[PDB]
C-alpha atoms as a printed R data frame, in Angstrom:
    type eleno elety resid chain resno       x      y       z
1   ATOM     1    CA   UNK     A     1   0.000  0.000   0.000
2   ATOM     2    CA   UNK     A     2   1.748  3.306  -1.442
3   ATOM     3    CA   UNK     A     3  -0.948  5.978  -0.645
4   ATOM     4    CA   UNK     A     4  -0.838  9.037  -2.961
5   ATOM     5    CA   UNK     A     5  -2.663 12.168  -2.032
6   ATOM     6    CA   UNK     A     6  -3.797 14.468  -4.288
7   ATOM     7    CA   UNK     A     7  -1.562 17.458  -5.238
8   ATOM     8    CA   UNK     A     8  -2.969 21.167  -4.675
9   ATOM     9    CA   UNK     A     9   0.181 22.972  -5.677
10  ATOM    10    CA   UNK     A    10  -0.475 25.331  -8.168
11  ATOM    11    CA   UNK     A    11  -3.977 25.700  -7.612
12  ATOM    12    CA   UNK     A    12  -5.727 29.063  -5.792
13  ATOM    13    CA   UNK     A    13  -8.919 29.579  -5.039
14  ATOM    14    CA   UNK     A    14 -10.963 32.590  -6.704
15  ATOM    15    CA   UNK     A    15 -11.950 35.447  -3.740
16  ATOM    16    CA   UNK     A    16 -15.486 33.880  -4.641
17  ATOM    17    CA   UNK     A    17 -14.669 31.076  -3.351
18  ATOM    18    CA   UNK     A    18 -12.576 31.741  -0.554
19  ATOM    19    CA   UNK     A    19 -15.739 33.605   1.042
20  ATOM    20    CA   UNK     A    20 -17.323 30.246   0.773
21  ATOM    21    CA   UNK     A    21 -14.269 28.867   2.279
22  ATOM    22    CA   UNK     A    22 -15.350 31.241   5.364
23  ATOM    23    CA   UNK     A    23 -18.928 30.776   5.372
24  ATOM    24    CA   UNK     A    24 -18.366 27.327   5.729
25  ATOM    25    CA   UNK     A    25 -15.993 27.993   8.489
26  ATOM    26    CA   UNK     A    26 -18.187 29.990  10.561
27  ATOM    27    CA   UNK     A    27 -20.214 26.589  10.033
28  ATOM    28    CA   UNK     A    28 -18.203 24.454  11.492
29  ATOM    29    CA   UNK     A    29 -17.481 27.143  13.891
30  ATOM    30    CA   UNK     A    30 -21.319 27.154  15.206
31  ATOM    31    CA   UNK     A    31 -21.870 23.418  14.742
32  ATOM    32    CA   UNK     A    32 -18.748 22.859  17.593
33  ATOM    33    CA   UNK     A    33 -20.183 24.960  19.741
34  ATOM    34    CA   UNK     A    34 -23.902 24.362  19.301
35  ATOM    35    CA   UNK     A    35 -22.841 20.830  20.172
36  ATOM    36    CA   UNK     A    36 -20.932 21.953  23.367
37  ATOM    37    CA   UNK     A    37 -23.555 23.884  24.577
38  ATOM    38    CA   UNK     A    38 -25.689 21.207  24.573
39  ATOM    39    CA   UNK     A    39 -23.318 19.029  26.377
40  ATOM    40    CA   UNK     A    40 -23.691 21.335  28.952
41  ATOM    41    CA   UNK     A    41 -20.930 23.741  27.936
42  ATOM    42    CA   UNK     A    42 -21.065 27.683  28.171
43  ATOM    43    CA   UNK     A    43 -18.992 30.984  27.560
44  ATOM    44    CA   UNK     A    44 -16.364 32.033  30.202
45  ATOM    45    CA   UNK     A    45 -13.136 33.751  30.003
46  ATOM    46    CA   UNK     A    46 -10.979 30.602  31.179
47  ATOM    47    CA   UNK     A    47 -11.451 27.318  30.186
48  ATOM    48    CA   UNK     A    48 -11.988 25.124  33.087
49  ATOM    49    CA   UNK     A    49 -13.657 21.648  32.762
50  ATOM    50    CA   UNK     A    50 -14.906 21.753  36.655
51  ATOM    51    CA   UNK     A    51 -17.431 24.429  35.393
52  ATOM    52    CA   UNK     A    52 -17.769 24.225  32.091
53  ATOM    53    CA   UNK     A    53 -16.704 27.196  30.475
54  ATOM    54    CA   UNK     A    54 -15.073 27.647  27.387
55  ATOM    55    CA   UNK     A    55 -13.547 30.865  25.413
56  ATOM    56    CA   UNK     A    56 -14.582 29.248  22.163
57  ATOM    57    CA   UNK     A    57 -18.200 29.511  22.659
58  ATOM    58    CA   UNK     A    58 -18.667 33.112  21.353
59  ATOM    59    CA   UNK     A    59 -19.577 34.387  17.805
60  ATOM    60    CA   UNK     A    60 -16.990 33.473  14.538
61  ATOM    61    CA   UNK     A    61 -16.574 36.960  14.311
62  ATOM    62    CA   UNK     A    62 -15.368 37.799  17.829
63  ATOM    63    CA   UNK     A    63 -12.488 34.595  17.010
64  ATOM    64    CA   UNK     A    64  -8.775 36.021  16.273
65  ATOM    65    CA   UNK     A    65  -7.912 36.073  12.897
66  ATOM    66    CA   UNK     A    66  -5.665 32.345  13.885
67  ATOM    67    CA   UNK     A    67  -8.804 30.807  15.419
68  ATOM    68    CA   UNK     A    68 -10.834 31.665  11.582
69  ATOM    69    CA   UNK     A    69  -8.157 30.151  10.132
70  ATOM    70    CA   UNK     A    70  -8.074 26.423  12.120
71  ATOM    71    CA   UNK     A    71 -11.632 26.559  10.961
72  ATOM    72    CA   UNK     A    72 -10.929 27.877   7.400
73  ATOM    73    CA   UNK     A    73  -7.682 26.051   6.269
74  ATOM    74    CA   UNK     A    74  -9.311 22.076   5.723
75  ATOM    75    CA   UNK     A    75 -12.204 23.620   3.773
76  ATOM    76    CA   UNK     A    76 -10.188 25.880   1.607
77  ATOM    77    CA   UNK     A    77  -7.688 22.946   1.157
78  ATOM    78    CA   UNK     A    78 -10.681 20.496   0.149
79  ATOM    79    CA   UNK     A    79 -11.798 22.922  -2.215
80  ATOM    80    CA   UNK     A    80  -8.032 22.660  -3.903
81  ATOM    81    CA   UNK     A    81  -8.214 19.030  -4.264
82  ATOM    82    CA   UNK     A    82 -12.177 19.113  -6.253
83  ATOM    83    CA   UNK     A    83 -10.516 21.755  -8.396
84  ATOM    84    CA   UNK     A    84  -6.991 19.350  -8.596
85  ATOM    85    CA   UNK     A    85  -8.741 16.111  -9.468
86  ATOM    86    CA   UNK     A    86 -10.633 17.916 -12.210
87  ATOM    87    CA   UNK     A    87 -14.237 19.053 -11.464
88  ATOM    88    CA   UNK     A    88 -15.737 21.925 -11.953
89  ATOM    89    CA   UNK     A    89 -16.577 24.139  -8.560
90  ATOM    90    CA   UNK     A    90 -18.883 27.045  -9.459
91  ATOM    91    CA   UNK     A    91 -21.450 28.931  -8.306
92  ATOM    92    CA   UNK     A    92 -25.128 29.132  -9.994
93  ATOM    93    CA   UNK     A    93 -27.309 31.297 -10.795
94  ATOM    94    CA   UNK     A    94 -28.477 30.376  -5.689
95  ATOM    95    CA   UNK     A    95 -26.864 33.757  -6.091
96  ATOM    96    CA   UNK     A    96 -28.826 36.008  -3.330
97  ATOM    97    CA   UNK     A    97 -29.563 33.270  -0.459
98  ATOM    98    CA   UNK     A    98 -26.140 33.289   1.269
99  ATOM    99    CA   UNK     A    99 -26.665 37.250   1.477
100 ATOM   100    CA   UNK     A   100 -30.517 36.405   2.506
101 ATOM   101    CA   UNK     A   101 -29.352 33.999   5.404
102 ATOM   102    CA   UNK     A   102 -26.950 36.748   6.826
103 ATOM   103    CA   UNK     A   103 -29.208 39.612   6.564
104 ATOM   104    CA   UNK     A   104 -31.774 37.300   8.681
105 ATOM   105    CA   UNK     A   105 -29.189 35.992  10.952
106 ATOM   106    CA   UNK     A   106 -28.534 39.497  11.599
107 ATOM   107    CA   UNK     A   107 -32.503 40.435  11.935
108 ATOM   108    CA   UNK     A   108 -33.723 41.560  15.687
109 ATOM   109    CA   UNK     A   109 -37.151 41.852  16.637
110 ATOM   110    CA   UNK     A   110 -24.618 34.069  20.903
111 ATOM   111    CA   UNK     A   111 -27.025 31.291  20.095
112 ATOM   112    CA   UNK     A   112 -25.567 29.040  17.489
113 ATOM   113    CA   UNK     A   113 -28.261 27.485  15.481
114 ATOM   114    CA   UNK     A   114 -26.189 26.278  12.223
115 ATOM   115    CA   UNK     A   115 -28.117 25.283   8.629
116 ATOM   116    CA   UNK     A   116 -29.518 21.359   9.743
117 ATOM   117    CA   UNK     A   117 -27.277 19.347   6.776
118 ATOM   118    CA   UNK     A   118 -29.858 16.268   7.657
119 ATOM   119    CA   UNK     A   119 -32.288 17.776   4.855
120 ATOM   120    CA   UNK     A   120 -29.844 18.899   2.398
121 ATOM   121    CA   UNK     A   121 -29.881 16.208  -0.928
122 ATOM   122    CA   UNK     A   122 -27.129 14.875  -2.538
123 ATOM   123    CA   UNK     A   123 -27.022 13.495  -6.448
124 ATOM   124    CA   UNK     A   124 -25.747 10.151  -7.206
125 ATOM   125    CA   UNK     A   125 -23.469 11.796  -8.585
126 ATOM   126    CA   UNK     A   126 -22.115 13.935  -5.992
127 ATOM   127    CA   UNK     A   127 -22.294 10.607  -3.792
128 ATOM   128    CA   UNK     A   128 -19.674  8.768  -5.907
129 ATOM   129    CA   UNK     A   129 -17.425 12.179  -5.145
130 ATOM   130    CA   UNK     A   130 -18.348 11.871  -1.797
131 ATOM   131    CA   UNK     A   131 -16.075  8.975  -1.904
132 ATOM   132    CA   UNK     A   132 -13.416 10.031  -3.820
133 ATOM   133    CA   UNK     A   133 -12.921 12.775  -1.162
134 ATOM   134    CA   UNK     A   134 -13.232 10.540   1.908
135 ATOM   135    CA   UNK     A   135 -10.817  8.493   0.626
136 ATOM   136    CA   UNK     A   136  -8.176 11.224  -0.352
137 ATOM   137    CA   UNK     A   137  -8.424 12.288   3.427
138 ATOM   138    CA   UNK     A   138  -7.796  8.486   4.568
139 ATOM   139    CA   UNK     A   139  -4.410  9.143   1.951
140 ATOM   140    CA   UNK     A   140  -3.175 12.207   3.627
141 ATOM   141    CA   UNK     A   141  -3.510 10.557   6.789
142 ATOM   142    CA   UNK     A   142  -2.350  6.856   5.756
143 ATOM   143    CA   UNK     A   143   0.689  8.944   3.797
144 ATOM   144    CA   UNK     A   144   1.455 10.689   7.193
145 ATOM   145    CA   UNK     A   145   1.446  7.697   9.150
146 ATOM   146    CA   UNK     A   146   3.677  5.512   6.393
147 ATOM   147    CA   UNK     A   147   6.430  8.441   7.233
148 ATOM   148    CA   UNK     A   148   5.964  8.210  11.105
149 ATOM   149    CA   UNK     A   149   6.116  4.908  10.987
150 ATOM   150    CA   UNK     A   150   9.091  5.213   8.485
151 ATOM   151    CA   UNK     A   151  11.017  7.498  10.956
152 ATOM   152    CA   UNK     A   152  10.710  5.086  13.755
153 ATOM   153    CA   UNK     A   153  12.486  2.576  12.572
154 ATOM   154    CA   UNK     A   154   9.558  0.909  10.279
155 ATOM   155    CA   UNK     A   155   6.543 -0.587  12.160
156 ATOM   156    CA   UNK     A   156   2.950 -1.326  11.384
157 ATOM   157    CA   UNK     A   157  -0.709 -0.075  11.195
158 ATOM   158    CA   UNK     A   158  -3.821 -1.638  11.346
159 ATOM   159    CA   UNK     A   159  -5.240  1.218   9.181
160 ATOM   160    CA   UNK     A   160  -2.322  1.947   7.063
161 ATOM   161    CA   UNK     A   161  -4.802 -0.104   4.127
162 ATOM   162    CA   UNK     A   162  -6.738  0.909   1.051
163 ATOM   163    CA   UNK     A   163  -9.717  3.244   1.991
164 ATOM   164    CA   UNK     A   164 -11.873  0.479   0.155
165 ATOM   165    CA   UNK     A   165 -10.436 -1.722   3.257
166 ATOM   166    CA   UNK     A   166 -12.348 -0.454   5.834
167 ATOM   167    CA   UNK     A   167 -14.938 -1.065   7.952
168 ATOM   168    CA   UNK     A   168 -18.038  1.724   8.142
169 ATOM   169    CA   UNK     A   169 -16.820  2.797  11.340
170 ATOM   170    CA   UNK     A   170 -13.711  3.221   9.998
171 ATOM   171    CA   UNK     A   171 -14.496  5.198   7.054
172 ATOM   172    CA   UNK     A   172 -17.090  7.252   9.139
173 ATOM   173    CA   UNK     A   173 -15.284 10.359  10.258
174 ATOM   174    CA   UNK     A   174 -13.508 11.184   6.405
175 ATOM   175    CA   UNK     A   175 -16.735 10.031   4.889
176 ATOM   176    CA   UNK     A   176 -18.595 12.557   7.311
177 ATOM   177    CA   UNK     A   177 -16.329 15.432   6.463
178 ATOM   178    CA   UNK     A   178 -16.788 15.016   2.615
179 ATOM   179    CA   UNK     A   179 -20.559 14.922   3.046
180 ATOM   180    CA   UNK     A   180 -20.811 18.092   5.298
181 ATOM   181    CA   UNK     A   181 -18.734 20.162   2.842
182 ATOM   182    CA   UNK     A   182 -20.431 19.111  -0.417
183 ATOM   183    CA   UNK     A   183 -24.263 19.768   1.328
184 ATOM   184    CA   UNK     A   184 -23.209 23.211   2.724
185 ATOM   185    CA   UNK     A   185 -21.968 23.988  -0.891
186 ATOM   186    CA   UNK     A   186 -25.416 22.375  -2.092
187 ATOM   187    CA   UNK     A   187 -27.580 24.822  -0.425
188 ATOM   188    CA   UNK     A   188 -24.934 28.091  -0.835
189 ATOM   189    CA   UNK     A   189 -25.252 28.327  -4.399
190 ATOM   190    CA   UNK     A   190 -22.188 26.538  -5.149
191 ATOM   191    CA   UNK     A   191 -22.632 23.705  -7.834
192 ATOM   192    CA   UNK     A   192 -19.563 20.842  -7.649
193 ATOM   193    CA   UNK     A   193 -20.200 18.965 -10.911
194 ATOM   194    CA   UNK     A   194 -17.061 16.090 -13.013
């Protein structure tokens, strides 16, 4: 097993596209921390685990610059690899309803509520790519762990095998990331297509 990710050099995202890239981080941004909250997590200054308070529970914008960018960088990157392996990432003409959705987030008359992915559709299509990028992330990290284990003197891995290999469970977490990124684009007027 020789795993080959796929090369992004060269490739740069349009400023279109990299706003996407930061929608989508704000996201997973709310998503973390709609999650903690209801684990019983809140705001505070300090994080301490006795109380349950944590820094990162406050609005994307109010993050430093560094804390967008965690969010940002593995959505920009996957964004490299749809335009590397040769589709087509562009946005249709789903034009206003990004805008729409801030101007109503923004509408009185921090919460996070994030856009419920559960309802979003997916084309056969976009399924099969689904797969192609959950098994690109099981490269990069099967690639990475080839070279650790490399450095060490050689070794093995129970999960240093083909993508195809293994189990659900297994596959779960890289097969969850593709999805996510691929429904958000869905209903942000962003059409991935071969």
């Amino acid at each position: 097993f020789d795993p080959k990710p796929i090369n992004t050099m060269n490739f740069s995202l349009p400023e279109k596209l990299e706003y996407i890239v930061t929608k989508y981080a704000e996201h997973s941004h709310d998503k973390w921390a709609c999650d903690k909250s209801q684990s019983g997590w809140k705001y505070g200054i300090s994080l301490d685990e006795n109380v349950k308070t944590h820094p990162l529970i406050r609005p994307f914008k109010t993050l430093t610059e560094k804390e967008k960018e965690i969010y940002r960088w593995p959505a920009r990157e996957s964004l490299k690899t749809m335009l590397a392996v040769g589709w087509t990432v562009e946005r249709t003409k789903g034009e206003a309803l990004v805008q729409q959705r801030e101007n109503e987030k923004l509408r009185s008359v921090y919460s996070p509520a994030p856009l419920d992915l559960s309802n979003v559709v997916l084309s056969r299509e976009l399924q099969g790519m689904v797969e192609v990028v959950a098994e690109n992330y099981h490269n990069i990290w099967a690639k990475k762990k080839k070279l650790e284990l490399e450095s060490k003197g050689g070794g093995s891995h129970p999960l240093l095998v083909p993508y195809d290999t293994l189990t659900a469970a297994e596959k779960f977490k890289d097969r969850e990331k593709a999805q996510d990124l691929f429904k958000f684009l869905q209903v942000n007027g962003i059409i991935v297509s071969r």
